[PDB]
C-alpha cells in the first residue's frame, strides 16, 4: 500500500546501504520470526544504534537468499505512522486506516510489518508521539499471530509500556541491541566507505576514519557512536567539496575534519584537536596562567591526573580521586571549571548542603513520587548518563549523613553506579572531585588560654577525623590550598574593576582606580574565613552603589571621567565627580 | 502552483540579503550531503527564516555561492492554492504529481516550502489517504530531490518526536537574533516601500534609535520584527496624528512615543524623565514605613542600579529576600513599593502552593487534562504585566521544587511554560519574604540582672535555604525590631486610618499627644512588632466609638475628644455631637 514501503522491493532496485556486523543480533530475529507462537520480534535499543538498519538489512538477506526456506517468500513492510495520523482530526479515524492495511496484509501469507517507533502508537496515556490509543489495534494481531510485527522501541519506553502491559510483553520477544565496539565501528565505516566516496567524489584517508570516531564520541557528547561516524564523514565530504571557490582537495586529513566537529560541538578547533597529551603536558602552565595563587596545590593535581590517563591500573575504577581541602574564596571552585574548560569535558555541580536530609539522599538515585516520570531518573545518575565526560564538584561534603558517604565508597571500588530504573552508569571516564571547608573553624577558633596567642596550624589533622578511615584509603591524594597573600588579593580586585569598566563602556563613562584605593578594597573585601567571597559585595557597595546615585542625577550623567581617592586621616573613600 | 525564486531575484522582487553568512554556509554544507540533504531553518517569529531562504536565491544569481550550487534554481510551493484550491479529489493528486516530474530530472532544482509544519497536518476532502507529505516521502528518502523548510521552536519539537522518519531526513539549523548593526541596514533596504506608502521620510537616526528603543522596552517580539512594527506605525502616526500640520519628516521624538505605546509604559519614560520617581522613592517609603531606614536604603539602592544600567540586562530588576520578626512590615513595604512606582503588584501566596502537584500550576499544567487550557498562573501574570512586582510571601512553606524555578529566573531571566509561551522577567522585580527569623529566645537570661542575650541572625536561614539559591539573591535585606521611639510614629498613622473610616460617618476624632503615648507603651511588644498597636487602637478607641455610633449621640455624627487622667491613668472619652 501507499502507507508502507516494501523493503524487499526497495532492496531489489538498490538504494539501501549494506549491513556490516550485527550477525549475533540479527540472527536472533530470524530465530524468533520462525517460531510458531510469540514470533513478534522486539528491537529494544538506544537511539543511534541502528535498529532500522537491522530491519532494512534483514530484508536484504531475503532478496539475496541468505535465509531459511520459510523466509524465502517473506516480505517486510515498514509502517508509516505519520501517514496514518496525518489528516485524521478525529480520535478513531486513525484506527480505521490501520484496519484497512491490516486486512490487506492478513490476506497475503508470509507478511511482516516493521512498525518503527512502536512506542509512539501504544503509549499508556497522553503522549507527545502518536497520541493514538493503538493498544486496541495491536493486541488482536499479536494474539492472532497471523502477521508478525517488528518494533523498534527504546530501552526507556520498553521498561514502562511493554513491561507494565502483560499482553504486549507476552507477545513480544526482546532483542537487546548494544553499541558496537570501536574496532567494529571502523569496520562498518570501511564497508560503507565506497558509497559516500562515490557521491562526494572524494577519497577519505584510513587515518581520518579511525581518528574521526575517537574524537566524535568524546567531543560531541550528543548522539551515539554509530550515528556520529556516519554524520561526520558525510559532513566532512560536503565541507571540503565546496570550501574553495575553484580549488578542491580530493584527499582528506585529520586536521580538516576536526574543524567540522567544532561547529556541531561548539568547541574551539584547538581543543577539538587530538592533542590531549599536549594539553596534559602543559596543564600546570595553563592553570597557573589562567588563574593565580595556590601554585603548590595546582602542581600536585597535574601529576596525579597524568597517572590515571597513562592507562595503568584497573580501568573499571574511576579516573578522578581528589579531595580538595582549604578555605573558600581562594579560587578552589575556579580550578574545577578551568580544568574542565581546558580538557573540554563538561562541568556538573552538585552541592551536598542541599542533599543533607536523609530523604534527600534518595533523590540522587530516584525521585520519591516519580512513578510516571521514569525518564528523569535519579538526579546524579541522569547527569552522568547524559554526560559521560564531565567533572563532578561536591561542596561541603563534611556535613552529610553517614549513608551518603557509602554511596561514594561503592563507585570508588566498583566504578559502576546502579539505578532503580535499571540504567547502567560508568564512572570510568568521569572525574570526581569534592571540596570540604573543614579545619578553618579550628584555626580561627579563639584559644581559651589567658594569652589567646595560641595558633593551631594543624588543620590537616581535623580533615582526617571528619572523614572515616575507609574513605581515606580509596583516595590516592588530597589537595590542600594554602592561605593567600595580600599581594595576590590585589589582582583579584582588578578583576572586578575590569568587569565594571567594560559595563561602563556601553554608556561612555570612564573609571580610574588609584593604587591606594585598591589596598582599601583588598582588606575590606578579603576575610580569613570567607576569603575573596565578600569582594563581590564590597566592590559593589563601595564602587557601584554611590556611582548609581550620581549616574542617576549629577555631573556623572554625561561626560564620565570618574576619579576615586581616599583621605589618609579617616581612611574613607571619596569619589570625585566630573561632567 | 509554484513560483521560481531565482527568476524573482532577477526582477528584484526580493531585496538584497544582508548578513547571515555563517547560516548560509551551514545550509549549503548540509544540503550537499548524501543523506540529510534537506536543511530546516528552525527559528522564532520574525527572525527571517523565510528571508534567508529567499536571500539564498539572490546569492545564486549574483554568484557569491560556491560553484557546487551554481546553475541551481529555487522554487516555492503554493501553500494557499494546495490547501484550498484543490478542494476536489483527484485534482490535488494530478497537479502535485506534475510538480514531482518537474522537480526530478533536474538535480540543480531545489524546492523550498515555508511553514513546512503545515504539510504534516494535511487535509483530505474525502479521506483519500494521500497528502503532500506522503507523496514527497519516497522522493526524499531516495534523495532525488532536496527541500528546505521553516518552523517555530515550539512547533519544531512538536513534530520532531511525533515523526522520526521526517526528522531524520531534515537537518536542524539554529537561528539567532541578528546584531543591531545588521538590523539598521535592512530597514534602509525596506525604507522605499514603507516611506513611499505613508509619503514621509525616515531620518537615519530614527532607524538606529528604533532598534535600540525596541529591544530595551519591547521584549515580547524579536528585534527584526520589532523594527518593522515601530517603523510602519511611526509613518502611519505622522499621516493621521498631525492632521493640522501634517509633518512630512519623521523626527526621533516621534518613534520613541510609538515604542512607549506599543510597550505599554508611561509616557516620558523614553525621555528618561522618570528618574525623579526613583530619586524620591526613598522618602515615600520612610514616611509610610518607620524603623526600617536601613532596610529601605538597601532596597532603594539596588533598584537604582537596575534602571541605571549597572547590572546584567538578562538579570531581573531585583531579587531580594525579606526576613525578620513579626510585625516589621516586611510585606507592607512591598505593597507600598508598587504604589510609589505605580506598577501593578502581583501577589502569590506560597501557603497555597505547598505541594509538589500544586507547584506545577506555577509553570502550567500537563497536557491532555481539563487544566491544560488554564496555563501557567505565574507566566500569565508576568506576561500581562511586564512592569510589575512579584511577591512570594512565606517562601519557606512552599515545596523545594519552586526554588528550581526561581534559580532559573535569577540566572537566565526568562521562563517558558509547557505550552511554549516565553515570559520575560527583565522589567519585573522579585521581592520574596520569609518568617524564619521570627524564632528567638522568649525566656530571659538567668541572673539577678538580665542581659541582652539576643540570638544570632541568618544562621537558621542557611540551613533552610540552599547555598546556590542564597548566593543568587542580590541582597538579603534584614528587618530590625520596632523600638519604643518608632512605635510613636506607627500610632500616628493608625489614627489617620481610623479618621478616614470615621469621615464616612460624619465623626471627627481628635486625640491628645499624651493619649498617644499611653496607647504606645500599653501594647509595645518587641516580639509582636506593630500588630499590638492595632489591637490597642481597636480595644481602646474603636470599641467605645462603635457603641455610640450604633446606640448613642454619634449616630448622626460629631466631634469627640480623648484625654487620659493623671490620677487614674485611664483614657476619658468626651462626645459633643
Amino acid at each position: 500500500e501507499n502507507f508502507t514501503t516494501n523493503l524487499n522491493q526497495l532492496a531489489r532496485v538498490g538504494g539501501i546501504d549494506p549491513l556490516i556486523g550485527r550477525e549475533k543480533e540479527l540472527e536472533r530475529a530470524i530465530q524468533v520470526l520462525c517460531r510458531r507462537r510469540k514470533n513478534n520480534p522486539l528491537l529494544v535499543g538506544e537511539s543511534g544504534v541502528g535498529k532500522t538498519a537491522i530491519a532494512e538489512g534483514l530484508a536484504w538477506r531475503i532478496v539475496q537468499g541468505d535465509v531459511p526456506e520459510v523466509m524465502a517468500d517473506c516480505t517486510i513492510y515498514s509502517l508509516d505512522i505519520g501517514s496514518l495520523l496525518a489528516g485524521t482530526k478525529y480520535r478513531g479515524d486513525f484506527e480505521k486506516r490501520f484496519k484497512a492495511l491490516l486486512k490487506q496484509l492478513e490476506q497475503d501469507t508470509n507478511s511482516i510489518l516493521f512498525i518503527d517507533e512502536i512506542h509512539t502508537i501504544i503509549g499508556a496515556g497522553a503522549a507527545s508521539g502518536g497520541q493514538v490509543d493503538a493498544a486496541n489495534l495491536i493486541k488482536p494481531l499479536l494474539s492472532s499471530g497471523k502477521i508478525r510485527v517488528i518494533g523498534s522501541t527504546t530501552y526507556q519506553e520498553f521498561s514502562n509500556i511493554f513491561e507494565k502491559d502483560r499482553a504486549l510483553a507476552r507477545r513480544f520477544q526482546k532483542i537487546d541491541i548494544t553499541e558496537p565496539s570501536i574496532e567494529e565501528t571502523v569496520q562498518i565505516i570501511n564497508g560503507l566507505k565506497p558509497k559516500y566516496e562515490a557521491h562526494h567524489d572524494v577519497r577519505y584517508t584510513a587515518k581520518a576514519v579511525r581518528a574521526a570516531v575517537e574524537l566524535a564520541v568524546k567531543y560531541i557528547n550528543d548522539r551515539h557512536l554509530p550515528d556520529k561516524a556516519i554524520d561526520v564523514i558525510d559532513e566532512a565530504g560536503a565541507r571540503a567539496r565546496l570550501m574553495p571557490v575553484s580549488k578542491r582537495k580530493k584527499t582528506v586529513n585529520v586536521a580538516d575534519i576536526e574543524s567540522v566537529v567544532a561547529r556541531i560541538a561548539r568547541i574551539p578547533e584547538k581543543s577539538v584537536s587530538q592533542s590531549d597529551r599536549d594539553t596534559l603536558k602543559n596543564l600546570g602552565d595553563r592553570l597557573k596562567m589562567l588563574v593565580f595563587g595556590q601554585d603548590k596545590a595546582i602542581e600536585a593535581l597535574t601529576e596525579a591526573i597524568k597517572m590515571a590517563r597513562a592507562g595503568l591500573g584497573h580501568e573499571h575504577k574511576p579516573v578522578g580521586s581528589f579531595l580538595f581541602a582549604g578555605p573558600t574564596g581562594v579560587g578552589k571552585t575556579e580550578v574545577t571549571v578551568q580544568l574542565s574548560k581546558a580538557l573540554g569535558i563538561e562541568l556538573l555541580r552538585f552541592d551536598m548542603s542541599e542533599y543533607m536530609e536523609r530523604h534527600t539522599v534518595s533523590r540522587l538515585i530516584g525521585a520519591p513520587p516519580g512513578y510516571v516520570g521514569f525518564d528523569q531518573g535519579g538526579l546524579l545518575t541522569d547527569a552522568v548518563i547524559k554526560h559521560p565526560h564531565a567533572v563532578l564538584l561536591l561542596d561541603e561534603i563534611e556535613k552529610a549523613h553517614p549513608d551518603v558517604f557509602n554511596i561514594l565508597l561503592q563507585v570508588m571500588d566498583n566504578g559502576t553506579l546502579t539505578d532503580n530504573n535499571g540504567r547502567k552508569a560508568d564512572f570510568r571516564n568521569v572525574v570526581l572531585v569534592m571540596t570540604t571547608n573543614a579545619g578553618v573553624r579550628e584555626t580561627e577558633r579563639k584559644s581559651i588560654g589567658l594569652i589567646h596567642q595560641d595558633n593551631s596550624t594543624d588543620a590537616m589533622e581535623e580533615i582526617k577525623k571528619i572523614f572515616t578511615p575507609e574513605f581515606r584509603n580509596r583516595l590516592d591524594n588530597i589537595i590542600w590550598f594554602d592561605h593567600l597573600s595580600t599581594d595576590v588579593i590585589h589582582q583579584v580586585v582588578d578583576k572586578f574593576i575590569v568587569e565594571l569598566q567594560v559595563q561602563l563602556d556601553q554608556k561612555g563613562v570612564s573609571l580610574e582606580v588609584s593604587q591606594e584605593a585598591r589596598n582599601w578594597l583588598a582588606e575590606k573585601g578579603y576575610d580569613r574565613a570567607m576569603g575573596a567571597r565578600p569582594m563581590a559585595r564590597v566592590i559593589q557597595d563601595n564602587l557601584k552603589k554611590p556611582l548609581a546615585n550620581e549616574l542617576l542625577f549629577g555631573s556623572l550623567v554625561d561626560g564620565g571621567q570618574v576619579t576615586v581617592a581616599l583621605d589618609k586621616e579617616k581612611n574613607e573613600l571619596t569619589y570625585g565627580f566630573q561632567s | 502552483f509554484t513560483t521560481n525564486l531565482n527568476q524573482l531575484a532577477r526582477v528584484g522582487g526580493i531585496d538584497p540579503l544582508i548578513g547571515r553568512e555563517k547560516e548560509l554556509e551551514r545550509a549549503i554544507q548540509v544540503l550537499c550531503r548524501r543523506r540529510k540533504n534537506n536543511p530546516l531553518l528552525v527559528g522564532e517569529s520574525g527572525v527571517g527564516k523565510t528571508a534567508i531562504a529567499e536571500g539564498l536565491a539572490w546569492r545564486i544569481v549574483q554568484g557569491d555561492v560556491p560553484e557546487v550550487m551554481a546553475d541551481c534554481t529555487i522554487y516555492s510551493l503554493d501553500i494557499g492554492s494546495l490547501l484550498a484550491g484543490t478542494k476536489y479529489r483527484g485534482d490535488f493528486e494530478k497537479r502535485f504529481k506534475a510538480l514531482l516530474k518537474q522537480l526530478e530530472q533536474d538535480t540543480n532544482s531545489i524546492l523550498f516550502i515555508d511553514e513546512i509544519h503545515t504539510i504534516i497536518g494535511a487535509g483530505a476532502a474525502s479521506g483519500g489517504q494521500v497528502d503532500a507529505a506522503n507523496l514527497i516521502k519516497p522522493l526524499l528518502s531516495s534523495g532525488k530531490i532536496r527541500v528546505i523548510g521553516s518552523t517555530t521552536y515550539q512547533e519544531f519539537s512538536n513534530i520532531f518526536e511525533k515523526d522520526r522518519a521526517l526528522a531524520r531526513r531534515f537537518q536542524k539549523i539554529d537561528i539567532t537574533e541578528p546584531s543591531i548593526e545588521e538590523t539598521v541596514q535592512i530597514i534602509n533596504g525596506l525604507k522605499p516601500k514603507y516611506e513611499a506608502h505613508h509619503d514621509v521620510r525616515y531620518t537615519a537616526k530614527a532607524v538606529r534609535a528604533a532598534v535600540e528603543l525596541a529591544v530595551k522596552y519591547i521584549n515580547d517580539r524579536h528585534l527584526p520584527d520589532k523594527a518593522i512594527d515601530v517603523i510602519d506605525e511611526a509613518g502611519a502616526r505622522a499621516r493621521l496624528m498631525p492632521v493640522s500640520k501634517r509633518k512630512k519628516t519623521v523626527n526621533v521624538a516621534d518613534i520613541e512615543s510609538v515604542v512607549a505605546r506599543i510597550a505599554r509604559i508611561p509616557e516620558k519614560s523614553v525621555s528618561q524623565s522618570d528618574r525623579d520617581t526613583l530619586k524620591n522613592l526613598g522618602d515615600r517609603l520612610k514616611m509610610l514605613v518607620f524603623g526600617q531606614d536601613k532596610a529601605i536604603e538597601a532596597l532603594t539602592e539596588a533598584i537604582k542600579m537596575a534602571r541605571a544600567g549597572l547590572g546584567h540586562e538578562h538579570k531581573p530588576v531585583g531579587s531580594f529576600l525579606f526576613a525578620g520578626p513579626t510585625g516589621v512590615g516586611k510585606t507592607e513595604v512591598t505593597v507600598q513599593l508598587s504604589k510609589a512606582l505605580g506598577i501593578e503588584l502581583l501577589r502569590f501566596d506560597m501557603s497555597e502552593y505547598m505541594e509538589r502537584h500544586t507547584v506545577s500550576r506555577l509553570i502550567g499544567a500537563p497536557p491532555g487534562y481539563v487544566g491544560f487550557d488554564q496555563g501557567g498562573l505565574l507566566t500569565d501574570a508576568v506576561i500581562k504585566h511586564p512592569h510589575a512586582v512579584l511577591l512570594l510571601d512565606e517562601i519557606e512553606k512552599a515545596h523545594p521544587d519552586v526554588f528550581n524555578i526561581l534559580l532559573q529566573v535569577m540566572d537566565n531571566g526568562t521562563l517558558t511554560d509547557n505550552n511554549g509561551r516565553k515570559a520575560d522577567f527583565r522589567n519585573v522585580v522579585l521581592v520574596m519574604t520569609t518568617n524564619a527569623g521570627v524564632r528567638e529566645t522568649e525566656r530571659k537570661s538567668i541572673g539577678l540582672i538580665h542581659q541582652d542575650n539576643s540570638t544570632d541572625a541568618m544562621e537558621e536561614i542557611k540551613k533552610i535555604f540552599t547555598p546556590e539559591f542564597r548566593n543568587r539573591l542580590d541582597n538579603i535585606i534584614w528587618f530590625d525590631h520596632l523600638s519604643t521611639d518608632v512605635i510613636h510614629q506607627v500610632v500616628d498613622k493608625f489614627i489617620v486610618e481610623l479618621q478616614v473610616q470615621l469621615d464616612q460617618k460624619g465623626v471627627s476624632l481628635e486625640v491628645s499627644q499624651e493619649a498617644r503615648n499611653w496607647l504606645a507603651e500599653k501594647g509595645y511588644d518587641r516580639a509582636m512588632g506593630a500588630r499590638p498597636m492595632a489591637r490597642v487602637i481597636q480595644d481602646n478607641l474603636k470599641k467605645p466609638l462603635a457603641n455610640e455610633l450604633l446606640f448613642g449621640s454619634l449616630v448622626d455624627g460629631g466631634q469627640v475628644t480623648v484625654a487620659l487622667d493623671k490620677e487614674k491613668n485611664e483614657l476619658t472619652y468626651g462626645f459633643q455631637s
Binding site: 496515556g125 497522553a126 512513578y371 | 502537584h357 487534562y369
Partner: peptide
C-alpha cells in the same frame, strides 16, 4: 518511625464529538 508518603491519582480526559450533516441537494 519514618514519615509516610502519599500518592496522587491523575484522571485521563477523553470526549466524544457529534457530527453534523449537509445534504448535497
Amino acid at each position: 518511625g519514618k514519615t509516610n508518603d502519599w500518592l496522587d491519582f491523575d484522571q485521563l480526559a477523553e470526549e466524544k464529538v457529534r457530527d453534523a450533516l449537509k445534504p448535497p441537494s
